[PDB]
Structure 1
Amino acid sequence: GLFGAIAGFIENGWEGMIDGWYGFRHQNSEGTGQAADLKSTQAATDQINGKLNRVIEKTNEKFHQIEKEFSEVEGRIQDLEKYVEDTKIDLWSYNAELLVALENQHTIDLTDSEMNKLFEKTGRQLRENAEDMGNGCFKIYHKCDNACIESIRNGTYDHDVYRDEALNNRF
């Protein structure tokens, strides 16, 4: 994708993550753990539901049309009836092929984008108390107990609290 997170600087997905699309894995003093991020998951699924509902908007109700199969050779009028239908079918087949290609390219790019957005949001939360390892992981330069992790994950992490501790561990 265009943002380079999914199948990019993040090496792979997590098969073990079943309660969300994006999230967090950590190691601290108290061990390891995993939690889904609801907001980013929601932003992706809401966008995909949106496009899904636009694509399947029932738009086509037709009754009496032209004949499209013929039991007899007739020449000119039948050549035209067939050519009309064949033309229509090719144009719609093209529309269908293009639509899915554009939609799918965009779905890959928007999901990649939401991964990237969560990563940039986290980095911004952490200010000078952490560094980007470059593989989707932050090294946090202070004691971050399970309460501190949940604070990063649920948006309540005050960086000033740990700043001096972290600044000294970094420099």
Structure 2
Amino acid sequence: IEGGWQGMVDGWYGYHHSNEQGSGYAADKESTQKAIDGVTNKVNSIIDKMNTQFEAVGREFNNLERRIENLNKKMEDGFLDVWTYNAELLVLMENERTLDFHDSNVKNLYDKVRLQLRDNAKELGNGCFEFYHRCDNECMESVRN
């Protein structure tokens, strides 16, 4: 699979069913509905997990308290660096699994149409399969159920 389809507007994952006369796309609502839930749960988890995080406070020190002034500065910068790292890393982790989540679902949908029809159909590649009979728009939608 080289590139994506610009034509597909409805959903994220879908079937491009092309009958003897007609030709058009169709989004898989069974997968796309479950996908919108998966993304909205992971984003809210990142929001809730980072609520306990360091809060810097202004402290003042005189000219002969330079050591503790420096200690204070180092300490507050220290925690801000730690939580910056945690936030950035968690985003990279969530991004990795989000893209793998998409590739997982696309390839699961490939195997769904392939595996369901063992002796009747054989997968040529890129999603598409073979048959011993022609397939009208009525037949095209039959693979879903």
TM normalised by structure 1 equals 0.74
Q: Distance in 2 between matches of 1:91 and 1:61?
A: 10
- Aligned position for 1:3: none
1:29 maps to which of 8, 20, 39 = 20
Deviation at 1:101, TM superposition (A): 0.7
Greater shift in the superposed pair: 43-52 or 130-139: 130-139
Q: Which amino acid aligns with 1:121?
A: K
Question: Is the counterpart of residue 95 in structure 1 residue 86 in structure 2?
Answer: yes
- Aligned position for 2:118: 127
1:145 maps to which of 125, 136, 139 = 136
Q: Distance in 2 between matches of 1:62 and 1:112?
A: 36
**Alignment coverage as a number of residue pairs:** 143
Q: Distance in 1 between matches of 2:92 and 2:132?
A: 44
- Aligned position for 2:99: 108
Q: Which amino acid aligns with 1:146?
A: N
Question: Is the counterpart of residue 47 in structure 1 residue 25 in structure 2?
Answer: no
Q: Which amino acid aligns with 2:29?
A: L
Question: Is the counterpart of residue 136 in structure 1 residue 127 in structure 2?
Answer: yes
- Flag the 1:30–1:126 CA change in 2: closer, same or farther, 3 A: farther
Structure with bigger strand share is 1
Q: Quote the RMSD (CA, aligned, Å).
A: 2.3
Q: Distance in 1 between matches of 2:112 and 2:47?
A: 34
Q: Residue 23 of structure 2: SS of its match in structure 1?
A: strand
Q: Distance in 2 between matches of 1:61 and 1:76?
A: 26
Question: Is the counterpart of residue 59 in structure 1 residue 73 in structure 2?
Answer: no
Q: Which amino acid aligns with 1:43?
A: K
Contact 1:130 1:138 (8 Å CA) reproduced: yes
- Flag the 1:112–1:62 CA change in 2: closer, same or farther, 3 A: closer
- Flag the 1:76–1:56 CA change in 2: closer, same or farther, 3 A: same
Gaps of at least 5 residues in structure 2 are none
Q: Which amino acid aligns with 2:107?
A: N
Deviation at 1:71, TM superposition (A): 8.5
Query: Which structure has the higher relative contact order (CA within 8 Å, separation 6+)?
Result: 1
Deviating beyond 6 angstroms after TM superposition, the runs of 4 or more aligned structure 1 residues are: none
